[PDB]
Design a protein around this ligand. Structure first.
Ligand SMILES: *[C@@H]1O[C@H](CO[C@@H]2O[C@@H](C)[C@@H](O)[C@@H](O)[C@@H]2O)[C@@H](O[C@@H]2O[C@H](CO)[C@@H](O[C@@H]3O[C@H](CO[C@H]4O[C@H](CO)[C@@H](O)[C@H](O)[C@@H]4O[C@@H]4O[C@H](CO)[C@@H](O[C@@H]5O[C@H](CO)[C@H](O)[C@H](O)[C@H]5O)[C@H](O)[C@H]4NC(C)=O)[C@@H](O)[C@H](O[C@H]4O[C@H](CO)[C@@H](O[C@@H]5O[C@H](CO)[C@@H](O[C@@H]6O[C@H](CO)[C@H](O)[C@H](O)[C@H]6O)[C@H](O)[C@H]5NC(C)=O)[C@H](O)[C@@H]4O[C@@H]4O[C@H](CO)[C@@H](O)[C@H](O)[C@H]4NC(C)=O)[C@@H]3O)[C@H](O)[C@H]2NC(C)=O)[C@H](O)[C@H]1NC(C)=O
Ligand SMILES: *[C@@H]1O[C@H](CO)[C@@H](O[C@@H]2O[C@H](CO)[C@@H](O[C@@H]3O[C@H](CO[C@H]4O[C@H](CO)[C@@H](O)[C@H](O[C@H]5O[C@H](CO)[C@@H](O)[C@H](O)[C@@H]5O)[C@@H]4O)[C@@H](O)[C@H](O[C@H]4O[C@H](CO)[C@@H](O)[C@H](O)[C@@H]4O[C@H]4O[C@H](CO)[C@@H](O)[C@H](O)[C@@H]4O)[C@@H]3O)[C@H](O)[C@H]2NC(C)=O)[C@H](O)[C@H]1NC(C)=O
Ligand SMILES: *[C@@H]1O[C@H](CO)[C@@H](O[C@@H]2O[C@H](CO)[C@@H](O[C@@H]3O[C@H](CO[C@H]4O[C@H](CO)[C@@H](O)[C@H](O)[C@@H]4O)[C@@H](O)[C@H](O[C@H]4O[C@H](CO)[C@@H](O)[C@H](O)[C@@H]4O)[C@@H]3O)[C@H](O)[C@H]2NC(C)=O)[C@H](O)[C@H]1NC(C)=O
Ligand SMILES: *[C@@H]1O[C@H](CO)[C@@H](O[C@@H]2O[C@H](CO)[C@@H](O[C@@H]3O[C@H](CO[C@H]4O[C@H](CO)[C@@H](O)[C@H](O)[C@@H]4O)[C@@H](O)[C@H](O[C@H]4O[C@H](CO)[C@@H](O)[C@H](O)[C@@H]4O)[C@@H]3O)[C@H](O)[C@H]2NC(C)=O)[C@H](O)[C@H]1NC(C)=O
Ligand SMILES: *[C@@H]1O[C@H](CO)[C@@H](O[C@@H]2O[C@H](CO)[C@@H](O[C@@H]3O[C@H](CO[C@H]4O[C@H](CO)[C@@H](O)[C@H](O)[C@@H]4O)[C@@H](O)[C@H](O[C@H]4O[C@H](CO)[C@@H](O)[C@H](O)[C@@H]4O)[C@@H]3O)[C@H](O)[C@H]2NC(C)=O)[C@H](O)[C@H]1NC(C)=O
Ligand SMILES: *[C@@H]1O[C@H](CO)[C@@H](O[C@@H]2O[C@H](CO)[C@@H](O)[C@H](O)[C@H]2NC(C)=O)[C@H](O)[C@H]1NC(C)=O
Ligand SMILES: *[C@@H]1O[C@H](CO)[C@@H](O[C@@H]2O[C@H](CO)[C@@H](O)[C@H](O)[C@H]2NC(C)=O)[C@H](O)[C@H]1NC(C)=O
Ligand SMILES: *[C@@H]1O[C@H](CO)[C@@H](O[C@@H]2O[C@H](CO)[C@@H](O)[C@H](O)[C@H]2NC(C)=O)[C@H](O)[C@H]1NC(C)=O
Ligand SMILES: *[C@@H]1O[C@H](CO)[C@@H](O[C@@H]2O[C@H](CO)[C@@H](O)[C@H](O)[C@H]2NC(C)=O)[C@H](O)[C@H]1NC(C)=O
Ligand SMILES: *[C@@H]1O[C@H](CO)[C@@H](O[C@@H]2O[C@H](CO)[C@@H](O)[C@H](O)[C@H]2NC(C)=O)[C@H](O)[C@H]1NC(C)=O
Ligand SMILES: *[C@@H]1O[C@H](CO[C@@H]2O[C@@H](C)[C@@H](O)[C@@H](O)[C@@H]2O)[C@@H](O)[C@H](O)[C@H]1NC(C)=O
Ligand SMILES: *[C@@H]1O[C@H](CO[C@@H]2O[C@@H](C)[C@@H](O)[C@@H](O)[C@@H]2O)[C@@H](O)[C@H](O)[C@H]1NC(C)=O
Ligand SMILES: *[C@@H]1O[C@H](CO[C@@H]2O[C@@H](C)[C@@H](O)[C@@H](O)[C@@H]2O)[C@@H](O)[C@H](O)[C@H]1NC(C)=O
Ligand SMILES: *[C@@H]1O[C@H](CO)[C@@H](O)[C@H](O)[C@H]1NC(C)=O
Lengths: 450, 126, 116, 126, 126, 48
């Protein structure tokens, strides 16, 4: 009657926060991309033709992107998925050979590119092979007549040649939750990734997420809603990288304007090395273009979003990177299979006070790659035939502040980053994982029988 | 009215009892990187069954709702019926009781089915 | 034990530039920030910047910016630091030092320098 | 009479109700290439339990047979009792109803145990 | 009194009925060398559920205790009630009956729920 | 005792040409074969 008992309840809407192993999803059309396992999607589960999403009313959940384990689970996936792809391919350890390199045939006006002859092996264990290839200077280092050279990795890390069949192209991946767990999508427009979320809905799977591997600039990514949102785990800490989300995409046109020959060299049985033959015709250097207008337009839309965090009237300056490896000092990205590195000094060379043509970015291509920096193991990307071209929506940024210096006069900012987790945060800010507690116990006037 | 899965989360607890058939329904859902999904779907049944055990070792096993002869200590969030179901959601509610939950279950499993079901035999033996 | 072992002392003409090597040992090299600090005779300590050994990220003060070039050889586990355009005021005893915890930790790199 | 496992398949549906203890009994059965068998035996419990859920979320959970207060829409193969159990096997039968099965269950889970078990509390609270 | 898990093993069988909530409670417990633990925890549910099946296909499914309309053949260790529960532990007891166990279950699954539950319908159809 | 249960008044439609059992087995013999090949001696020094 009036006194209270206990009564069990199965299936109550109750969840607790916990982490658990998730799994992927990448449609069924990207499954048809095949071409001998392009990049990732293989056992990737198909997507619900109706990605059902359930809004949750009077539900206020506390989201964090900077601590979201989903970033680490994904981060370790891209890495391990990459080694599986590297394993079946050709080990280029026989390439660690003294190289007779000559500068490239141009009418003065100086090379970056070396016409390197060298002895190789054949499928016959005794017969050897006097061959030559071309290499960018970043892949070789001279070793002390004309100068002999060797691959920059050969002295630290073993090297393997990426399978020419696998493609490095990104594919939208939907991360998914098993039964007993579900995913929470923070939907409010102006949301700094930290703190609770007003509008909370649940999905069983994130949206299509392309694992773009790029430094400084973010490409092909998610855009912000209304104002451009600026998220950093901590801004007082200048050391904490600052992640930016656009409301509008910035176009960029990147090329390798060089028609490329590719020689396949027989070191077998079964082992074959893809060298570079001649460039066909004019030698031009890789570059990217950006509409100087829309670019400078986006610089201002941002700088007006910054004074929201620093002064009503103040000065804002942009500088190029202070220092680091090539991956950080310049803009790393894979365009068309080759790996580009573009001088962004011309993008970050500006100053801002309280109140038609296009830029062009000199780019550099490397083939021997140690991405994720893991010594002992390097990947040699084979060359891509013909002229390369690709175009991307610039959709975010990774930036670092400066130091105490002068107090309040002005603050400087530069590109940065290089940790691909931050590339993943750009998409998982609005996501987090929870486990259910469906058993409910509560008092009431009910009692079972005798 | 079908608000979908977990629709009644921000609903008061009384409104959420309409949805037990929804949250309990999809609680199960019928090389390298294949591992990723495999160990995942196993935790679903490891998770689901541990309740069936709790639900089972108590006077229930019959899913959704089920009552019990265990009383309610006022030392566990002494409240009025309306102050709970009508004014609280489950999250607000489950947030409080999480202290004595383990103390609660030790009754339902031991004081009840361990004791009450034997009395049934003592009554049914004649 | 860890060990920060720096290069030998150097006697130099003004206007020039000078590097200092500082070779680390006894811990995960690439995971720990490295600060460089000069201390002019009898004077206090001048923080000159730091490097993260993963991909080589850096950050210098406004005073020391321009003159400082700070690097590391992950392969060899050697930190390099170069003040340039040396003036008589640039006479000091230059240190490298490691922060308390690895880069994975919160608030690294601003906690406090342990190995010296 | 024990015709073995699935003996009453070609039997009319009424004759097949004698064999529920047979088909339900063996429904569970107590490196490389070892993988082959492992993921297999897991699907057995994933498969078996999804019914226990359905059986459980409905007025059953008590295996073999169990009735329900859900009526029968004649829009689902309006037939006579004998025209079904006596003249049809289960295969012939299950072949027809597979259209409205999902429409049927939404009642048993929601219209029944989601609704009927709460009425039980409303009756048992006094 | 809580003697812990399996405390009443050397206890006479009657004293061991106090501990069913203890032995049944922890019967589930909520690369290379990781394999080692993984296939292990799977056998736990494969093991646990095969009883739920037996318990379920019989007149039980309701855990701990449950009675049955199957008689007792004196050809299975004809003893007095006290000579068993009071003078024997379970180990001593289970040691004997292991001959006709399979013969016993064929009744509980077939003679009972296969037969008794249908009579329920024959009674509930009117 | 490979127990076999005949099924009365049971008429099932069989296909051998589409039977997936052939593919599952086919891929098994192949993969089982590479596992056997893996630990053995690489004769790449014989390419002489
Ligand atoms: C880097 O890289 C590079 C590049 O390469 C390229 O690219 C690549 C990628 C690929 O593609 C490749 O292929 C290419 O090549 C490299 O370099 C280089 O290059 C180049 C280019 O071109 C090349 O060259 C080529 O080659 C070829 C071959 O030839 C050879 O062979 C043949 C056969 O087949 C023959 O016939 C010839 O003659 C040659 O040689 C020869 O050999 C023989 C044998 O060995 C010898 O004999 C010897 O002798 C001696 C004595 O003397 C002794 O006895 C010994 O024992 C023996 O043995 C001989 O001598 C030889 N010859 C001579 C002459 O010497 C081919 O095919 C070609 O050619 C063709 O075409 C052309 C046109 O186009 C022609 O004509 C020419 O022209 C030009 C102009 O235009 C000239 O130049 C000039 O020169 C002069 C001097 O002399 C001066 O310097 C001037 O200034 C200049 O300008 C030249 O010279 C010419 N040539 C001659 C050869 O002569 C030619 O001829 C031909 O055609 C034809 O012709 C005829 C006449 O003869 C006529 O009649 C007709 O009409 C025509 N046709 C037409 C259609 O045209 C070319 O030459 C090379 O090879 C390469 N190399 C290599 C190694 O590869 C490099 O190397 C790299 N690097 C690294 C480090 O790696
Ligand atoms: C940000 O996003 C944008 C947009 O998402 C990306 O832009 C992409 O840039 C890449 C280069 O970085 C471009 O990829 C290359 O494009 C080639 C053009 O293909 C089109 O034309 C041909 C001929 O007309 C058609 O057959 C193609 O159709 C194919 O794709 C459609 C879907 O769009 C399918 O329906 C078809 O069935 C086809 O599959 C296209 O319309 C293309 O040639 C090239 O693919 C070759 O090269 C790779 C290796 O480089 C091989 O693995 C692959 O097998 C192909 O090889 C064939 O072709 C080459 C000649 O190109 C021959 O040498 C070979 O013998 C062989 O026949 C590659 O896909 C891409 O077009 C462009 N757009 C899109 C939408 O992706 C940015 O890159 C991205 N930024 C970052 C940083 O990720
Ligand atoms: C691939 O690998 C081969 C083998 O390692 C390299 O070619 C050899 O390079 C060496 C180094 O120069 C050459 O050695 C030279 O040989 C001359 C004598 O050779 C005679 O006998 C050989 C057979 O043993 C005949 O083939 C040849 O015709 C001659 O009759 C000497 O003249 C040289 O020494 C003198 O000249 C040089 C300048 O040329 C001076 O610097 C010396 O001080 C000295 O005065 C010299 O020793 C050798 O002949 C080459 N060929 C062979 C062994 O067949 C390739 O270069 C290499 N390619 C790569 C790495 O890309
Ligand atoms: C980066 O993240 C950190 C937290 O992780 C945020 O840093 C906070 O910043 C503010 C301003 O710098 C600090 O707040 C001030 O702290 C004083 C004392 O701090 C003690 O008490 C707090 C509890 O409030 C403890 O957490 C802390 O450990 C100390 O023991 C208070 O006296 C201040 O309140 C009064 O002063 C300020 C102005 O001085 C007024 O605005 C207030 O209204 C009030 O009068 C004040 O709260 C705070 O301590 C910092 N927190 C921490 C944990 O260090 C950064 O803001 C964040 N960066 C960005 C850009 O968001
Ligand atoms: C990223 O991007 C930045 C900015 O674009 C690059 O910085 C440039 O670096 C180069 C290389 O030093 C600098 O180029 C210098 O320019 C002078 C121009 O020569 C003529 O041009 C002007 C007008 O057109 C005339 O006034 C002038 O008199 C000349 O007629 C040259 O004088 C320099 O070369 C000469 O001087 C040096 C000594 O300083 C000698 O050693 C040389 O041999 C030579 O005689 C020189 O080439 C350029 O100014 C820099 N710009 C800026 C803004 O800093 C970075 O290089 C780039 N980084 C990467 C990694 O790509
Ligand atoms: C991000 O925005 C949220 C609100 O959207 C801020 O959360 C506040 O955090 C403080 C603790 O410092 C709490 O006491 C407040 O209650 C929170 N406010 C709200 C409205 O929930 C958070 O500080 C912001 N963080 C950054 C880095 O911008
Ligand atoms: C990058 O290239 C794209 C397409 O390759 C350019 O967009 C086209 O620009 C031309 C003029 O050059 C217009 O006629 C087309 O209508 C545009 N097409 C589309 C789909 O936009 C783009 O302008 C280039 N951007 C830069 C900065 O060079
Ligand atoms: C969320 O809370 C609001 C406020 O308590 C609920 O809205 C009330 O709904 C009742 C019943 O329809 C109305 O009588 C009240 O007037 C409403 N008030 C307001 C302020 O909206 C709402 O139903 C709740 N929804 C959920 C899903 O929890
Ligand atoms: C298969 O079908 C046949 C025909 O319906 C069944 O045989 C009948 O069985 C009944 C009951 O014993 C007899 O009265 C009839 O005379 C039989 N007729 C024929 C033609 O056989 C048979 O029992 C069915 N068996 C199964 C397993 O379905
Ligand atoms: C183990 O066996 C002994 C002997 O049967 C049990 O001890 C008896 O316990 C009863 C009840 O308390 C006493 O009346 C007897 O006097 C005891 N006798 C002896 C010899 O100890 C003991 O309880 C049993 N314990 C278990 C766990 O089986
Ligand atoms: C019932 O509650 C009794 C009182 O608990 C004590 O007082 C309350 C108000 C809280 O402060 C609590 O922490 C104190 O321990 C307990 O002594 C008694 O064990 C409880 N009984 C059960 C079965 O839980
Ligand atoms: C009960 O059946 C009603 C009638 O269904 C319609 O008519 C039958 C004869 C078929 O043609 C069928 O496809 C038609 O939709 C339904 O309107 C009604 O929803 C049904 N109710 C339930 C609970 O299923
Ligand atoms: C009941 O028991 C009958 C007798 O079993 C026989 O005699 C006993 C004393 C033992 O020696 C035993 O081995 C013999 O078979 C059985 O004939 C009968 O089948 C039993 N019934 C059941 C249902 O088990
Ligand atoms: C940059 O953008 C501003 C608008 O904020 C515009 O007025 C100005 O002309 C632009 N300048 C250049 C150099 O593009």
């Amino acid at each position: 009657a009036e006194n209270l008992w206990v009564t069990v309840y199965y299936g109550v809407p109750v969840w607790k926060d916990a982490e658990t192993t998730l799994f992927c999803a990448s449609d069924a059309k990207a499954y048809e991309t095949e071409k001998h396992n392009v990049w990732a999607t293989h056992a990737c589960v198909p997507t619900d033709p109706n990605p059902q999403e359930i809004h949750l009313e009077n539900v206020t959940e506390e989201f964090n992107m900077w601590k979201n384990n989903m970033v680490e689970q994904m981060h370790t996936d891209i890495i391990s998925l990459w080694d599986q792809s590297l394993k079946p391919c050709v080990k280029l350890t026989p390439l660690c050979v003294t190289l007779q390199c000559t500068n490239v045939t141009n009418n003065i006006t100086d090379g970056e590119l070396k016409n390197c002859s060298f002895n190789m092996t054949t499928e016959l264990r005794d017969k050897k092979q006097k061959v030559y290839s071309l290499f960018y200077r970043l892949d070789v280092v001279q070793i002390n007549s004309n100068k002999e050279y060797r691959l920059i990795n050969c002295n630290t890390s073993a090297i393997t040649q990426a399978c020419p069949k696998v493609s490095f192209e990104p594919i939208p991946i939907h991360y998914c939750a098993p039964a007993g767990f579900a995913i929470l999508k923070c939907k409010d427009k102006k949301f700094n990734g930290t703190g609770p979320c007003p509008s909370v809905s649940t999905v069983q799977c994130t949206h299509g997420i392309k694992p773009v591997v790029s430094t400084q600039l973010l490409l092909n990514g998610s855009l912000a809603e209304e104002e451009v949102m600026i998220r950093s785990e901590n801004i007082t800490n200048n050391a904490k990288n600052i992640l930016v989300q656009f409301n509008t995409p910035v176009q960029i046109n990147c090329t390798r304007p060089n028609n490329n020959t590719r020689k396949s060299i027989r070191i077998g049985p079964g082992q074959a090395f893809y060298a570079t033959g001649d460039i066909i015709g004019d030698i031009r250097q890789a570059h990217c273009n950006v509409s100087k207008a829309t670019w400078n337009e986006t610089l201002g839309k941002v700088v007006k979003q910054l004074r929201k965090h620093f002064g009503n009237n103040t000065i804002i300056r942009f500088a190029n990177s202070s220092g680091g490896d090539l991956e950080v000092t310049t803009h790393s990205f894979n365009c068309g299979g080759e790996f580009f590195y573009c001088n962004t000094s011309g993008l970050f060379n500006s100053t801002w006070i309280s109140n038609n043509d296009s830029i062009t970015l000199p780019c550099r291509i490397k083939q021997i790659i140690n991405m994720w920096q893991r010594i002992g193991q390097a990947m040699y990307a084979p060359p891509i035939q013909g002229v390369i071209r690709c175009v991307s929506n610039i959709t975010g940024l990774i930036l670092t502040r400066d130091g105490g210096s002068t107090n309040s006069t002005t603050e400087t900012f530069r590109p940065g980053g290089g940790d691909m987790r931050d590339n993943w945060r750009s998409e998982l800010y609005k996501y987090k994982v929870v486990k259910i507690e469906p058993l409910g116990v509560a008092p009431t006037r009910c009692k079972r029988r005798v | 009215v079908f608000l979908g899965f977990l629709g009644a989360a921000g609903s008061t607890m009384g409104a959420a009892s309409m949805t037990l058939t929804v949250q309990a329904r999809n609680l199960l859902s019928g090389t390298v990187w294949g591992i990723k999904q495999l160990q995942a779907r196993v935790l679903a049944v490891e998770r689901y069954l541990r309740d069936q055990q709790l639900l089972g070792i108590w006077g229930c096993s019959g899913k959704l709702i089920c009552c019990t002869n265990v009383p309610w200590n006022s030392s566990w969030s002494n409240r009025n019926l309306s102050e709970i179901w009508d004014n609280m959601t489950w999250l607000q509610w489950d947030k409080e009781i999480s202290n004595y939950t383990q103390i609660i279950y030790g009754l339902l499993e031991e004081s009840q089915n361990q004791q009450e079901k034997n009395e049934q035999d003592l009554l049914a033996l004649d | 034990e860890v060990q920060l072992v720096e290069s030998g002392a150097q006697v130099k003409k003004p206007g020039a530039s000078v590097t200092v090597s500082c070779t680390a040992s006894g811990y995960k090299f690439t995971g720990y920030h490295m600060h460089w600090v000069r201390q002019a005779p009898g004077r206090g300590l001048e923080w000159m910047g730091w490097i993260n050994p993963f991909r080589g990220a850096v950050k210098y003060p406004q005073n020391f910016r321009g003159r400082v070039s700070m690097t590391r050889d992950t392969s060899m586990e050697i930190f390099y630091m170069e003040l340039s355009r040396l003036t008589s005021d640039d006479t000091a005893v230059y240190y490298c030092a490691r922060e308390m915890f690895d880069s994975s930790a919160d608030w690294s790199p601003w906690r406090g320098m342990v190995a010296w």
